Amino acid sequence: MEYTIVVAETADSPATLQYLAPYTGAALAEYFMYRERHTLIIYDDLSKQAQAYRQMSLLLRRPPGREAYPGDVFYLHSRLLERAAKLSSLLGEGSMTALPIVETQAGDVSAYIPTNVISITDGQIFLSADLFNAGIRPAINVGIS
Amino acid sequence: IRADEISKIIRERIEGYNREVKVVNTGTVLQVGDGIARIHGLDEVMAGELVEFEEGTIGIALNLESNNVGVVLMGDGLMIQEGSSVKATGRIAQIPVSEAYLGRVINALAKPIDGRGEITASESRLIESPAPGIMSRRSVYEPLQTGLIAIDAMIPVGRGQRELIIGDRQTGKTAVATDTILNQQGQNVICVYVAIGQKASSVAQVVTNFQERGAMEYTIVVAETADSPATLQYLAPYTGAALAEYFMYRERHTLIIYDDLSKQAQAYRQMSLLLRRPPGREAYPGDVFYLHSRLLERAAKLSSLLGEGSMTALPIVETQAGDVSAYIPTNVISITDGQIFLSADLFNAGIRPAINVGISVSRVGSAAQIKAMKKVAGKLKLELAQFAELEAFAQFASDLDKATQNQLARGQRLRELLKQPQSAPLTVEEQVMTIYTGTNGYLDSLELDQVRKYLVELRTYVKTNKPEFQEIISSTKTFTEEAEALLKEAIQEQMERFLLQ
Amino acid sequence: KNLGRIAQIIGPVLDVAFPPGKMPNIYNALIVKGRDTAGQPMNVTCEVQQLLGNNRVRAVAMSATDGLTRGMEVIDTGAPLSVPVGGATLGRIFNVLGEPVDNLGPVDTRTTSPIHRSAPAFTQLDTKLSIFETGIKVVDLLAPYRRGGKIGLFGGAGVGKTVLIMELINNIAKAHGGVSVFGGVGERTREGNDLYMEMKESGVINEQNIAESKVALVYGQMNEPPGARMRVGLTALTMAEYFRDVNEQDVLLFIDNIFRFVQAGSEVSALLGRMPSAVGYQPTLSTEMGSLQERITSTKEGSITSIQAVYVPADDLTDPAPATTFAHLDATTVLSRGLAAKGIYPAVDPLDSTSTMLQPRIVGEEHYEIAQRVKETLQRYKELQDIIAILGLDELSEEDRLTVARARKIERFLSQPFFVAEVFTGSPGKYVGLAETIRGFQLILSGELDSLPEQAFYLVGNIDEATAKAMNLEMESKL
Amino acid sequence: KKNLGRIAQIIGPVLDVAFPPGKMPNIYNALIVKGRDTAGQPMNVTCEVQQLLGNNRVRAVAMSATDGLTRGMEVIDTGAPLSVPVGGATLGRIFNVLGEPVDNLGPVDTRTTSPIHRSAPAFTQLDTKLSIFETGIKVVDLLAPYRRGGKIGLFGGAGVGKTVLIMELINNIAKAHGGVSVFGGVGERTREGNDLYMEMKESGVINEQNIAESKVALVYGQMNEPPGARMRVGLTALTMAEYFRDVNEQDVLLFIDNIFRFVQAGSEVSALLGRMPSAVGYQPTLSTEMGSLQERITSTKEGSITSIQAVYVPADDLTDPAPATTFAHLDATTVLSRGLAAKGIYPAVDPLDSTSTMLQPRIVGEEHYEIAQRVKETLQRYKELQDIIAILGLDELSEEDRLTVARARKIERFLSQPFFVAEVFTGSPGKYVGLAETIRGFQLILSGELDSLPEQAFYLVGNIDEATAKAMNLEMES
Amino acid sequence: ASELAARMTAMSNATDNANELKKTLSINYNRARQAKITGEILEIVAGANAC
Numbered sequence A: 001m002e003y004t005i006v007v008a009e010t011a012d013s014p015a016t017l018q019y020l021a022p023y024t025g026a027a028l029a030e031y032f033m034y035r036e037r038h039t040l041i042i043y044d045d046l047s048k049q050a051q052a053y054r055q056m057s058l059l060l061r062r063p064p065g066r067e068a069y070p071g072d073v074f075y076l077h078s079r080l081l082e083r084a085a086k087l088s089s090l091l092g093e094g095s096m097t098a099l100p101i102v103e104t105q106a107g108d109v110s111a112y113i114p115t116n117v118i119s120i121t122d123g124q125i126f127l128s129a130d131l132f133n134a135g136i137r138p139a140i141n142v143g144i145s
Numbered sequence B: 001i002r003a004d005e006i007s008k009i010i011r012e013r014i015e016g017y018n019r020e021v022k023v024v025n026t027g028t029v030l031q032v033g034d035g036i037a038r039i040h041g042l043d044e045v046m047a048g049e050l051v052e053f054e055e056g057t058i059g060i061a062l063n064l065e066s067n068n069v070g071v072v073l074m075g076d077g078l079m080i081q082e083g084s085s086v087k088a089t090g091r092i093a094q095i096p097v098s099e100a101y102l103g104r105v106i107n108a109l110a111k112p113i114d115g116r117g118e119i120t121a122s123e124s125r126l127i128e129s130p131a132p133g134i135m136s137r138r139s140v141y142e143p144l145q146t147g148l149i150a151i152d153a154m155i156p157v158g159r160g161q162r163e164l165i166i167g168d169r170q171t172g173k174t175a176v177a178t179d180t181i182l183n184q185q186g187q188n189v190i191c192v193y194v195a196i197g198q199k200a201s202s203v204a205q206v207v208t209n210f211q212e213r214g215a216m217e218y219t220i221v222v223a224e225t226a227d228s229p230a231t232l233q234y235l236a237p238y239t240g241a242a243l244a245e246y247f248m249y250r251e252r253h254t255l256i257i258y259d260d261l262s263k264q265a266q267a268y269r270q271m272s273l274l275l276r277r278p279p280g281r282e283a284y285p286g287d288v289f290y291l292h293s294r295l296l297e298r299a300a301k302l303s304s305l306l307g308e309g310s311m312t313a314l315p316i317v318e319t320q321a322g323d324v325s326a327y328i329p330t331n332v333i334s335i336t337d338g339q340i341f342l343s344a345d346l347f348n349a350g351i352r353p354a355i356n357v358g359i360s361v362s363r364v365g366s367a368a369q370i371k372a373m374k375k376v377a378g379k380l381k382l383e384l385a386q387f388a389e390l391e392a393f394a395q396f397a398s399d400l401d402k403a404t405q406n407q408l409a410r411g412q413r414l415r416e417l418l419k420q421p422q423s424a425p426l427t428v429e430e431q432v433m434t435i436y437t438g439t440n441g442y443l444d445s446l447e448l449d450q451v452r453k454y455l456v457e458l459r460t461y462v463k464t465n466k467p468e469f470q471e472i473i474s475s476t477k478t479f480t481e482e483a484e485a486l487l488k489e490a491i492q493e494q495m496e497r498f499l500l501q
Numbered sequence C: 001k002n003l004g005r006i007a008q009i010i011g012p013v014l015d016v017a018f019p020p021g022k023m024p025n026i027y028n029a030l031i032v033k034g035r036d037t038a039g040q041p042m043n044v045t046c047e048v049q050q051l052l053g054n055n056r057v058r059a060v061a062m063s064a065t066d067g068l069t070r071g072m073e074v075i076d077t078g079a080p081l082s083v084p085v086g087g088a089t090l091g092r093i094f095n096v097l098g099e100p101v102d103n104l105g106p107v108d109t110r111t112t113s114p115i116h117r118s119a120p121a122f123t124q125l126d127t128k129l130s131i132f133e134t135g136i137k138v139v140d141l142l143a144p145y146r147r148g149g150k151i152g153l154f155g156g157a158g159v160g161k162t163v164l165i166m167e168l169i170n171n172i173a174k175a176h177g178g179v180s181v182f183g184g185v186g187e188r189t190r191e192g193n194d195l196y197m198e199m200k201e202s203g204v205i206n207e208q209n210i211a212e213s214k215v216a217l218v219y220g221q222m223n224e225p226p227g228a229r230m231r232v233g234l235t236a237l238t239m240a241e242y243f244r245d246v247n248e249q250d251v252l253l254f255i256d257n258i259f260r261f262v263q264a265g266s267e268v269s270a271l272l273g274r275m276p277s278a279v280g281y282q283p284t285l286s287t288e289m290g291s292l293q294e295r296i297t298s299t300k301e302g303s304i305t306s307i308q309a310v311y312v313p314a315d316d317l318t319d320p321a322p323a324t325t326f327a328h329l330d331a332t333t334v335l336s337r338g339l340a341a342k343g344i345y346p347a348v349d350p351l352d353s354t355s356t357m358l359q360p361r362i363v364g365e366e367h368y369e370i371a372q373r374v375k376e377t378l379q380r381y382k383e384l385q386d387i388i389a390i391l392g393l394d395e396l397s398e399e400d401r402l403t404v405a406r407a408r409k410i411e412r413f414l415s416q417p418f419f420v421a422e423v424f425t426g427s428p429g430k431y432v433g434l435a436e437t438i439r440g441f442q443l444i445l446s447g448e449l450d451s452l453p454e455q456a457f458y459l460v461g462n463i464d465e466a467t468a469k470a471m472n473l474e475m476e477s478k479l
Numbered sequence D: 001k002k003n004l005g006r007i008a009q010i011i012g013p014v015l016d017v018a019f020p021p022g023k024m025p026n027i028y029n030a031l032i033v034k035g036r037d038t039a040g041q042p043m044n045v046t047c048e049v050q051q052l053l054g055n056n057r058v059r060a061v062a063m064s065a066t067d068g069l070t071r072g073m074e075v076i077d078t079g080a081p082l083s084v085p086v087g088g089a090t091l092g093r094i095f096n097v098l099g100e101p102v103d104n105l106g107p108v109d110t111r112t113t114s115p116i117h118r119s120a121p122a123f124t125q126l127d128t129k130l131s132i133f134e135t136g137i138k139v140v141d142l143l144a145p146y147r148r149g150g151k152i153g154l155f156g157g158a159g160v161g162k163t164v165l166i167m168e169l170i171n172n173i174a175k176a177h178g179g180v181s182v183f184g185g186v187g188e189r190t191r192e193g194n195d196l197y198m199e200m201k202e203s204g205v206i207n208e209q210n211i212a213e214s215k216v217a218l219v220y221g222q223m224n225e226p227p228g229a230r231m232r233v234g235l236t237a238l239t240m241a242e243y244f245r246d247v248n249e250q251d252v253l254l255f256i257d258n259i260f261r262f263v264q265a266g267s268e269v270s271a272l273l274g275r276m277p278s279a280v281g282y283q284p285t286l287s288t289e290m291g292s293l294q295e296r297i298t299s300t301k302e303g304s305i306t307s308i309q310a311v312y313v314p315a316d317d318l319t320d321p322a323p324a325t326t327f328a329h330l331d332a333t334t335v336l337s338r339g340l341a342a343k344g345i346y347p348a349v350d351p352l353d354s355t356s357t358m359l360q361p362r363i364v365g366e367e368h369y370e371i372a373q374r375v376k377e378t379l380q381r382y383k384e385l386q387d388i389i390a391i392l393g394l395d396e397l398s399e400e401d402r403l404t405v406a407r408a409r410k411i412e413r414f415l416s417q418p419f420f421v422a423e424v425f426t427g428s429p430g431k432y433v434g435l436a437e438t439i440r441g442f443q444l445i446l447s448g449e450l451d452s453l454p455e456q457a458f459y460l461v462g463n464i465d466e467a468t469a470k471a472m473n474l475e476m477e478s
Numbered sequence E: 001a002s003e004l005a006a007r008m009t010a011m012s013n014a015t016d017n018a019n020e021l022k023k024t025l026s027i028n029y030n031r032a033r034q035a036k037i038t039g040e041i042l043e044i045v046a047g048a049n050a051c
Ligand SMILES: Nc1ncnc2c1ncn2[C@@H]1O[C@H](COP(=O)(O)OP(=O)(O)OP(=O)(O)O)[C@@H](O)[C@H]1O
Pocket: B168, B169, B170, B171, B172, B173, B174, B175, B176, B352, B353, B420, B421, B422, B423, D327, D328, D356, D357, D358, D359, D360
């Protein structure tokens, strides 16, 4: 608990709060990484954040796009995933490694939100339900990871 | 030459000017946003008038409300002051036309984008001149040639018939379009390669190929930069259509190549969407059907009462992932005279051109091609359809019947006849030669993969030995026993020559 | 007065205003006139569907939007549009508004029926069910038409529907001594021109002397506005209506295409301030097809037999316009891209195509067993062909291996040539009699002619000619 | 100097600015907004007009973060379109969307500047020569020759190897031919932008001291940027490239990646502009903006602007319009199929759609033309046999079809080009091959010289003699 | 015996290959149907609410 600062809003929370919550997590992580220290942020789950933002946009009546998600969502996720880097000793070489948990649906990696967050990260980490029900725990498929 | 002579023409142009009493409709422009100009005032403006701005970037008035008028920017008006006196021109999108266009890369506002110099022109042809009448026109009874073997053979084009080249991208569609242009070298066929919404480097490449082939002496390329405003980018096929009407209305049969039409539909979609005209299905406006109808129906064959010319059309339509169930390749197949497909499978599988007759079709038929080839191989289209099915069926090849074995090897060698090299436009007599070589089963016993060599040897042998065949049949258009005898004779001789060896 | 202004023109939708003294009813023809681009006295006719308040009304125009400018006069005829109908209105090709577009002398315009009328109730409908033979093999076998019913050509992406219309018109126009009428509803103009040429050729129009032509040509262009195409089917229907009540003869309709009508209605309804619907169309599709297929009904006064082509987009059935068109059809023939790809024509899917007049007691209880047996082995073949394409016919066991080859012969045998399609095929076609059809099929389905090669059944009119072609094929197998 | 006034509305990134009724600014020109901030009132809020929207009011797009400013701020019309520093001042400098050097170096000299966009170059100012240069990646050099001066399209989804392929291509042609070599980053992972920046620093093509000897203008635009910024960085990079092809008159290398993010920025700004949507999500004007950004890339009469552009195909949809405009707008389509990367070949390039018009006999030699043919025939046949071999197993084929499948997989795993920059990613130090190998490895495969060595015996090795040595090693280890 | 054992393992791999190919095609169908009808719904509500 000293190592973490758990940020927890749940599915009861309005989709706006679930939208801005990982932004606040990234903000305090920016303060802590910014103060010379390494830090690690666990977005969990980023697909739920995409659903929350999509709901917020439709209640904003903004016309959604791909897979009925707004086109804004790529820049949106770019915000809270591009604030996560390792600085240099110009500013104190703090580092903000990130594990944005993103749940793909049925292995459809060619769905909009998963291919979007793959298009912003530094690579994939697989987890197949087949290897999970195949006794291999954890179920990281290293051939594509 | 500087400050020496043109002052007399200056005085000629000044003295003798109009000083007109022309009352004009003039509009104070209210709302310009992103290529459109919703203009305040401007009451008596005809929908379709060019509307002259402050700049000179004129514009068509498509929509018009009780308060505003939906006006597009043919030529993007990058600086237009609010409240500018934007008056119309009165006339309706007229197009100057002349035979001196024959070679000049021309822009959709009739402007030479060739670098060859401005064109004198007399008439002012409308942009929405309707189709010629129902009773006034004759059936497509007269042949028109491709230079490509398979389309001529199975799915013919006729002068006036509007065949629709279609297929996925990067499969030689523009290539076969230019090939069937520069086939026309002595057939008195004006070609209008209307290039729409692609690389100007590509249109420079095709006009380079035309300059190399010599075919740019008579053809008129209407280029469209992809940077052009989408109003111009959809307007240009109508300009090409009216320009071909200029030559068809004399007596002169002509050909047109829209290239492509899907970019026309997309640019028109963009203009209709910015005009806030509500979209139909697939997010398109509904009336891309109406747009392409007005386009392609302006392309037909005249009759003897008005000049018996023709405007055979080839609108290439781009479809993604080999689909037909996309909206614009669903409209144009309904409003074309049959369609030919360029499958990626058949292209990259060697059949170049890649017109699989299983899906490709010409819906006016052999009356639009020559009687000699008719009497030779009218049946060969359905024979190759059955061969395509049976060769799909010959996947289960364990104990094939001898009759279907002869059938599959026959249609196999036929399909190998329907392969032809890059830009080798065969004489139509030579197409009659190879199609009789196929339909008379001489090649049946021969080598199955050396049929291309057999054919080039045979065509060189007849074009040397008996060229009198070609002239007598091209003067009679009829497969007679003399043609038969000359054919089987050179067939025996060159079959000997290629047996040994 | 009734002279009003046109406030908004957006596409072929015309927002007409009017003074509060007069605001006319729906469906009424308005004619802006006297003006064009050349200062011509060019008129444009425009009817009304929605009237959007303040004594003003949004109209649809049956001619092109060019010419007329906002703030122009309008002359409503105080009535709905009326089409010139009569025996004088046979022969000549004429417009949706009725103007003779044959460019010679106009027909005598003295009997004009209103284009929008009531549909006949079923107390007036002739409930008499009847059988029709049209000479094309697979149709008179498996989809036998009603002489009096409604007949649909569910066509694919331009495959065999219009050439089938030409063939069937050629075969039955001389047969039916009563009147006939071809409705060109958004048809391709040069193919309608080819049809008109065939009517001039076969003398059904009798070019040298007219008004004895029992057929009547009316056409509306693809290039015409959707305001024109939204009512040209109504024009043809009203000509047939006049011949069905006033003339009350045997009347034959050949409208093509009804989906063009649907698309024009959808097209203009998107513009005239109305929401879309499910894929393709307007929300008024069901009522449009209701007006049509309730007005084309064989009446107790006079019979009618309206045949019609249905081009489904994307070549399917879940499409909503054929989802209601099947519901409004009674003799449905469904063409197939697959059977066109194998060249079999008419490329009908006989699994899909059926008819209400395929009852055993109404076709003959042996004809019905013929039809059921061929549909059985054919459907089983279409069921089997996928497993064939992965495991081999020669593997696929014998009690179905005879049936696959049998039905494979069957479909190509019921591909039969047409007297007009000879330009596309090579051999002049054949008018086949249904007794010859059931005879040849009683040979094949029984398995008497299982010795014949399959391509001996290819594109053949008679089973006797099939045996003759079989002997010819055996002769060429030796030679 | 020009019209001062007040912004009337701000809607997130997009802003609506009113003005004096006399003179409104141009369309497409820029203007800054002073606004406010925490400390000081900087001119960081640069802006750019999009739509004059009635009532002496323009609806405009921003370029920076749009927080802190309000309506009624002191807007400053600069009148002209957005100027940007050009020239040798660009060389090596990692500058940003408005041209300012964000490389923590000096503010570059404004003595030579240019507006952000211009007209399309001329019908005559297009070149004539169908130029071709190789790269070193054998699949490209076999079946997708690269129209230099034309447009070179990199397709594919995410995680299919596109920026890695761009890094390898720039790793070759940074010290290979070509003069000044402008990279542009449109929507780039900024850590990977600085990664390739450090790769250019270490490889020394850019210059640490005396930076004006670099022949590289890495004008990135980071993916974090606002939508107007991503909507303009492509025009900045193209302005640099056209400036060099007109003033340096140079064969300019135009690595850009990836312009799908550019048109996605266009879509997300149109959705707040209130322009009605289009196909599945995007702006209605995607065709015209892609037409701008492509038609302003040409090989001039003196500058063969060779552009290596990438397109992020969203969720591997070739039907999507963001591909469906670009691979009309370019010459060398190179689609990177994901399933090949799932199998494990790097780069993961199918042959069937990855193509060019440069694959032409009268350009590459009829020999190389038929070489690429005899590849493509076999591999297309392998696909049309693949979709029915995966069901129901291998040996249901003929002997010929089995041998053809073996040889097609030979070509496939033989095209596994080991990459010189991928050593730090996988471990294998990459290799370089050329045209002699391009003909000869094909020749051995299609003749049947290499016809018994297994599928690993040409796996991840470019040179066919290297494949023979690898075969010798694996046969030795038994 | 060896013939109908080789046939038996041919079917024992073909059944499983057909099953996994069916699984991939079912996922493809679900994604395609989802995408098509979402595009349909989004388009028609765009046209409906565009007034
Ligand atoms: N008969 C042929 N033999 C060999 N190659 C051919 C033949 N016909 C066409 N091609 C090839 O097809 C390639 C693609 O040409 P083209 O650009 O016309 O295809 P496309 O589908 O029209 O692409 P786009 O629509 O983008 O122009 C050309 O490079 C050309 O080499």
